[model samples]
Target: KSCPNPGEIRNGQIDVPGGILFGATISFSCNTGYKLFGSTSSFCLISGSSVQWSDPLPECREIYCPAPPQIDNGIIQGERDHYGYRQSVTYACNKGFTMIGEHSIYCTVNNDEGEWSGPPPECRG
Candidate 1:
């Protein structure tokens, strides 16, 4: 995973054909408050098999600008979104707390409870 100021471009450069040795594997995660600017995991051996590793999957964002649904606390917005895709922003709660249902939702693509469903809206305080 590679977050904390990442603009998609983990690292992938291929140009192997000398001794024939191509190997690449990718598996990273960083979504839910971001916390992996580097070294989340890396491995590459260009040559064949069509692999390049590094360049996506790294987010969790929550270092700040996310605590909106308050009152009793209830939020679940997180699933690869850096100002792209449906990229929506709503679901708030800060006045007296009175939003316990659909107030705003987006980031489609069949979001897996990344913020767009029921069972996550309940504020009574």
Candidate 2:
């Protein structure tokens, strides 16, 4: 006499429609160089099982850019990620010096390919 309704399964478990259980917990982490702007974790155990919200709360993140490094007068230019998935940053050094490393790199959704694509491009002195 205990069965979950359709589309009520979460995290590989059946959820009671109006039954009681432990509750749900959600945790969030911001991308690299980015800081969370709002709540990081949320818990719902109002009625022993039934949570008011189906999902956990999410917060916006802000991308933090370290102070521009000296690159023979080179400057950093790119769109900053304010929250969520961050954008790729392209580096361009002053003339004469060739940029070393991947031309562009961004965060990957996958685990294996989720590392900073290439090394920080180095400008030829």
How many clashing residue pairs are found in candidate 2? Answer: 2
- Taking all chains together, each candidate's TM-score versus the true structure is 0.21, 0.38
Candidate 1 residue lDDT tens string, 1-125: 21122224223222222322234344444443333444444444432544444344344432322223332554444533343224554545555666667655443322223332223456555
User: What range of 10 consecutive residues in model 1 has the weakest lDDT sum?
Assistant: 12-21
Question: Clashing residue pairs in candidate 2, if any?
Answer: 21-49, 61-82
Residue 78 of candidate 1: its Cα lDDT? 53
Candidate 1 error regions (>4 Å):
1-21, 35-60, 63-125
TM-score of 1: 0.21
Leading candidate by TM-score? 2
- The lDDT for every candidate, in the order shown, is 0.39, 0.44
Please give the range of 10 consecutive residues that has the lowest summed lDDT in model 2: 2-11
Model 1 error, position 125 (Å): 15
Candidate 2, residues 5-36, lDDT tens digits: the string is 22321212232334433354445454444444
Report each candidate's C-alpha RMSD, comma-separated, in the order given. Answer: 12.4, 7.8
